[PDB]
Design an enzyme around this catalytic site. Sequence first.
Site, PDB file in Angstrom:
ATOM      1  CG  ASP A  81      -1.799   1.259   1.289  1.00 55.17           C
ATOM      2  OD1 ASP A  81      -2.498   1.539   0.291  1.00 55.17           O
ATOM      3  OD2 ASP A  81      -1.772   1.962   2.323  1.00 55.17           O
ATOM      4  CB  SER A  82       0.205   4.778  -0.799  1.00 59.11           C
ATOM      5  OG  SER A  82      -0.906   5.026   0.047  1.00 59.11           O
TER       6      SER A  82
ATOM      7  CE1 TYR B  59       3.442   5.610  -3.311  1.00 58.72           C
ATOM      8  CE2 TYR B  59       1.936   3.815  -3.871  1.00 58.72           C
ATOM      9  CZ  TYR B  59       3.187   4.249  -3.465  1.00 58.72           C
ATOM     10  OH  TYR B  59       4.162   3.296  -3.218  1.00 58.72           O
ATOM     11  N   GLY B  60      -1.928   9.653  -3.765  1.00 63.26           N
ATOM     12  CA  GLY B  60      -3.056  10.408  -4.280  1.00 63.26           C
ATOM     13  C   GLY B  60      -2.752  11.621  -5.148  1.00 63.26           C
TER      14      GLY B  60
ATOM     15  CB  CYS C 262      -2.411   1.335  -2.813  1.00 62.79           C
ATOM     16  SG  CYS C 262      -2.476   3.103  -3.151  1.00 62.79           S
ATOM     17  CG  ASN C 263      -8.639   1.686  -4.013  1.00 57.83           C
ATOM     18  OD1 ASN C 263      -8.401   1.535  -2.818  1.00 57.83           O
ATOM     19  ND2 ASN C 263      -9.675   1.103  -4.619  1.00 57.83           N
ATOM     20  CB  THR C 264      -3.461   5.776  -5.630  1.00 57.24           C
ATOM     21  OG1 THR C 264      -4.524   6.485  -4.970  1.00 57.24           O
ATOM     22  CG2 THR C 264      -2.760   6.741  -6.573  1.00 57.24           C
TER      23      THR C 264
ATOM     24  CD  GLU D 237      -3.403   9.242   6.622  1.00 54.66           C
ATOM     25  OE1 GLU D 237      -2.605  10.158   6.884  1.00 54.66           O
ATOM     26  OE2 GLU D 237      -3.116   8.299   5.849  1.00 54.66           O
TER      27      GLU D 237
ATOM     28  CB  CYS E   9      -9.804   5.726  -1.425  1.00 54.35           C
ATOM     29  SG  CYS E   9      -8.490   6.488  -0.446  1.00 54.35           S
ATOM     30  CB  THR E  10      -6.597   2.223   1.533  1.00 52.91           C
ATOM     31  OG1 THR E  10      -5.974   3.515   1.474  1.00 52.91           O
ATOM     32  CG2 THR E  10      -5.908   1.292   0.551  1.00 52.91           C
ATOM     33  CG  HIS E  11      -7.238   6.526   3.900  1.00 53.82           C
ATOM     34  ND1 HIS E  11      -6.347   5.792   3.143  1.00 53.82           N
ATOM     35  CD2 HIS E  11      -6.485   7.266   4.752  1.00 53.82           C
ATOM     36  CE1 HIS E  11      -5.113   6.067   3.527  1.00 53.82           C
ATOM     37  NE2 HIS E  11      -5.168   6.958   4.503  1.00 53.82           N
TER      38      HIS E  11
HETATM   39  N1  LIG Z   1      -3.784   4.187  -0.357  1.00 52.26           N
HETATM   40  C1  LIG Z   1      -4.306   5.277  -1.190  1.00 52.26           C
HETATM   41  C2  LIG Z   1      -4.808   6.444  -0.331  1.00 52.26           C
HETATM   42  C3  LIG Z   1      -3.722   7.257   0.319  1.00 52.26           C
HETATM   43  C4  LIG Z   1      -2.768   7.829  -0.706  1.00 52.26           C
HETATM   44  O1  LIG Z   1      -3.174   8.776  -1.395  1.00 52.26           O
HETATM   45  O2  LIG Z   1      -1.633   7.314  -0.831  1.00 52.26           O
HETATM   46  C5  LIG Z   1      -5.472   4.788  -2.023  1.00 52.26           C
HETATM   47  O3  LIG Z   1      -6.057   3.744  -1.719  1.00 52.26           O
HETATM   48  O4  LIG Z   1      -5.865   5.464  -2.978  1.00 52.26           O
END
Ligand SMILES: N[C@H](CCC(=O)O)C(=O)O
Lengths: 276, 272
Positions: free
Chosen positions: A14-15, A46-47, A77-79, A156, A188-190
């Site tokens: 993940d990021s 990464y966003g 990570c979706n990004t 966060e 997105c993970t969050h």
């Molecule tokens: N893990 C990233 C979110 C946080 C980031 O922007 O790195 C995602 O799922 O898109």
Amino acid sequence: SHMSDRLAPIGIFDSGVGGLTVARAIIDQLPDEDIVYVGDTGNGPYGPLTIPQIRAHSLAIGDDLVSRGVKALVIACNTASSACLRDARERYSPVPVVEVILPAVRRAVAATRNGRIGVIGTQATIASGAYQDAFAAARDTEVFTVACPRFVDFVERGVTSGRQVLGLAEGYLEPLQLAEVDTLVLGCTHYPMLSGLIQLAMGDNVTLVSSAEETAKDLLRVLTELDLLRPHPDDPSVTAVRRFEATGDPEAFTALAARFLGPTLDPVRRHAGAGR
Amino acid sequence: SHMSDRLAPIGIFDSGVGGLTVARAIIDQLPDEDIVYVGDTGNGPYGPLTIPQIRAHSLAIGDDLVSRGVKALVIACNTASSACLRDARERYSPVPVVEVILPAVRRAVAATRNGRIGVIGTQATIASGAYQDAFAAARDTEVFTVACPRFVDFVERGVTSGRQVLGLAEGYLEPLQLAEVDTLVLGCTHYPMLSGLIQLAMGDNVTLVSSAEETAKDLLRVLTELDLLRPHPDDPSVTAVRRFEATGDPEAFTALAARFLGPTLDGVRPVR
Ligand SMILES: N[C@H](CCC(=O)O)C(=O)O
Ligand SMILES: N[C@H](CCC(=O)O)C(=O)O
């Protein structure tokens, strides 16, 4: 051998720390599996980044995990997944790649009633075209996308209810309401931590789809059909080995991880030393 | 007029340890809320019991939590909910009661495409008629219910994939497959831990609905509507006070809790 394949750990990356929503859902479904999780806290988020930057950081981690010997590679990570959706399968073949975009896309296609589907995620995720391309393969569906850049910060910091974040969500989500989507991918993970707030904004006729839940179930399916499940131990004292790695400061990783991991349940002091 | 203090904790109770899936989902949504969780490990499981037995055990805990001053009461147990769905709100009024049957029922009605909905849960939950009653308002809807008694055992032992449990699931779920349901309510605290296996058994068209997830979101909605959210602390060193109680053996509770909570900061130590 095929037996040695079954014994290798699952690699997850993940990021940063948000991917623990995916790791936690995987561990829920697959308690016997050994896990190596890598969070790129030293180079994320990464966003806001470009595709070349996201690929450079995330493929370095994926290459490392596969070089170390994993039975399967989870891009949590979706990004990161949006930036390598089209080439990660071949890049890591024959190691199976499970990532967070397609399991949610497939679920959303089945789950919609009116065929109008929304996706939210980071700027890079939404700008990449990844969800748009994935939904193009689904007959009788239309997809609408919105970037929600400030959501990651609010999650966060632990601000996931109340008037301020509701107003923020309403501003982002209005175009999806206007488009009358009835299904919304939390891309997105969050965003699992915002599901109650997003449900409040979207109303009860909108089906939210969690990337973490659909990917956890997808990984179980993938391991099952490849006969790659770690055998359940006969000795109940045997438990999975789970390892967590950060590219940034590990103390900051630990401090943020409490946002995404389950609560600790509710300790004599002793001076440590070799003089006694 | 009545006292309803946003600084007071949220009370959650369950037949035992399984209700931590609901508590975890609530804490995911509501990190600033103080929590008091009670799991009735000394008297459960509730699944095989009678309605008077389930009511006596669970209402004793609900009464205790309300007397201790919680601002809202969450019935995390689907079996306990099924036994007092008709009277819990009146019993504890004006304290809000959020439970695990109604939010998932409303979601499943919205989620179905073909109007054919299944429910799985414990024997007591399914025999109670509670889901049948909750779905009575659903138009253009056919509801089918199946009890899955051995699922709780398999979840607690961590056997949630592979050939044996799939065969168990197929034997239970066949009437729902024959009924061609396209939506399935996971009407038991333990069943989110089987969602991957149940999705495999049911096929990729079937929408699974988690009680824990729909109830966590409903609590956030309820607290929001009632102006009852505990405010976000301005000093981020302040964290929520969470207490977890068991009526049975406390060491046994702690050991089993790991199944449902997942890895926690007590054990995780990241490397660089
Ligand atoms: N893990 C990233 C979110 C946080 C980031 O922007 O790195 C995602 O799922 O898109
Ligand atoms: N908590 C119960 C499962 C365990 C039991 O039977 O007590 C339920 O949700 O139905």
